[model samples]
Each structure stands twice: as C-alpha cells, then as structure tokens.
Target: GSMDQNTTEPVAATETLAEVPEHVLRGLPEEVRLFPSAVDKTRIGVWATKPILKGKKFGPFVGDKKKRSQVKNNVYMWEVYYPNLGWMCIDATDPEKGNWLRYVNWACSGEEQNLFPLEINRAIYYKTLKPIAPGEELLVWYXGEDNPEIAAAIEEERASARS
Candidate 1:
C-alpha cells in the first residue's frame, strides 16, 4: 500500500533590520541600537545589536528623572514606584537627554515583547523576559494612563485566558 502526503502547514518567516555604522553604535549601548521598526516602517525602535541572554538587565534608563511637579505631559514617561521616594517619573520624551532605550517601542501583544521595565531603588531598568536574538526589537507593554485602553484590553485578554 502506497502512503499519501499528509503534512502540516508550513510556518512562515520574518523581517530585516537596518545596519548602524560603528560611529553611531559607539555612542549607543553595547548591546542595543536604534533602528526603524519592521512592524511600523515610519517609526524608529530599539533593537538588540548582539545576542542578549535571558535575565540580563539594561538601564536605570537615562532620562529626566523627576517628581510630578517638574514634568509636563509627554509620551516617553515611565512611572516609577519607589520605596521611600513615593512616585517618580522618567521623562524620556527628550531624545537628546535620553539614551537608546527611549526609542523602545510599545508591544501590542505579549508575544512581541521581550523586555519589562523594572523599578529598582527609584530607578527603572529593563530586564529581558527571555534570551533576545540579535536584531530583535525591544518592546514593552506600557501601562497606566499612558496606554489605558490597550493595557485594559491586554489585561482583560490575559484574565479571560487564565479563567
């Protein structure tokens, strides 16, 4: 008896990351670089320049670390919860004042994200969720008033999945 072909559907593939010259890379972090986002070509994003191990951390993100009174409404703000200092904000809206991390994009879904901002001792550091392959974009799920509707939806989606 002859056996027939009954295979599963083939899996598809991926994106291209633009190259950053050595002069530019020298000014940025050793592990990451800024690139135009593959997901949205019009915008730029932070991406791993080399292999990043799981659990490896980057930052105390360089930004305008300030109290609520000092900052204005901006898109690059990260709410930092502190132990003794109460609440603070890392205002990375000004690209000139901030590091490469300021370009880190917001992940629409859990699958696309590889980093999470970790607040430690009044500073925010990005910790990798998993080992990041070279050229993978660094995306985080921005929370709170910054992205309320999307955050709410993602929370609800996770909740429903768990139950």
Candidate 2:
C-alpha cells in the first residue's frame, strides 16, 4: 500500500523496478561507495565511505535488463515490481554496465549477512537491518536465510495433499 509496508510476502522471480527519490540519493554520503569484501567471491561489496545511521537506505535495484529464466543457474538477480512492468529481473553481474546498487552484496552462499533487500511498494531496496558502523561492509541477502525453509514446508504440504 505504501513504502516500508512490504514484508513477509512472496516475492516474484523477477519484478519491474520503480524509480527512486532524488533526495534519498542525495542524502547518501560520498563514503557510501563500493569496496572489496572478504566474504563475496567477487571481492566487491557496498560500504560507507562515511558513517551511516541505523536507517540509512537506498533505492530500487538499478542494473541492466535480464531475465531469470534466460540466465543460467547460479546467477544473481534482484526483483523489483513496477505498476507498468509488474516484475523484471535486474542483473548486475556484468562488469561492463550497472549502477552503484549493483555493488551491494546479494550473495546466497548460505551465511549470515547484515543488509537485507526488503521489497517495499513493489520496489527492491537495500535496507539496513543490522548495525552498520563506519567503514563497515554493507551485506545484503539475496535469498532469505530463514532456513530457505519455506521450500521444504511447501513440498511437505504438497505431498500430504496428494496422499
């Protein structure tokens, strides 16, 4: 219904991303830039060149066009929903093109991370859920680690229903 109201909902494989506010982009400090990360396989991640407060946020996952179905397995894409586009996958793995948000770590390697992508108002956003201090790496979760448990639960229900 409104921004910050999206959560606990099933996210589509791909979504159409909406535009972000200018102020939100402007409020961000220069320190908020890409940096090398020890965790990511690519050795790159988002970090604050300056200190960021608890709620400092960034917008709709900006990146080149891509389709989840077209891409091979083990590829990374964030889904954003737009009123006109509905759902579109934003691919950032390409080194040749993309925006700063592409640098945000959305790795699904099965470990704890700090920043989490929360879908708000049908748009993808990198929201800070953990304490991000000065010079700290902004870790974003591509797959929800709440066990990736829902998959198994769905299977269990399907099996029960068939029996």
- TM-scores for the candidates: 0.59, 0.52
Would you list the C-alpha lDDT of every candidate in the order shown?
A: 0.57, 0.47
> Once superposed on the true structure, which residue ranges of model 2 sit more than 4 Å away at CA?
1-30, 71-76, 80-87, 106-112, 145-163
Worst 10 residues of 2 by lDDT: 9-18
| Residue 10 displacement in candidate 2 (angstroms) | 38
lDDT of 2: 0.47
Question: Candidate 1 lDDT, tens digit per residue, 1-163?
Answer: 4678544422222322344333333455555766665434335556776887555566657667676665653334667766657666768544467556666776665556666655455566666546677667777765643453333433443344467
Which regions of candidate 1 fall more than 4 Å away from where they truly are? 1-29, 67-76, 81-86, 142-163
Q: TM-score of predicted model 1?
A: 0.59
Clash number by candidate, in order: 0, 8
RMSD of 2: 14.6
lDDT of 2 at 138: 56
Question: How would you encode candidate 2's per-residue C-alpha lDDT over 1-163 as one tens digit per residue?
Answer: 4677533422232211222222223334444654554335444445566654443455555545566675443223556666777677766554345455655554343233444554445545554433455555555644544543323333433344367
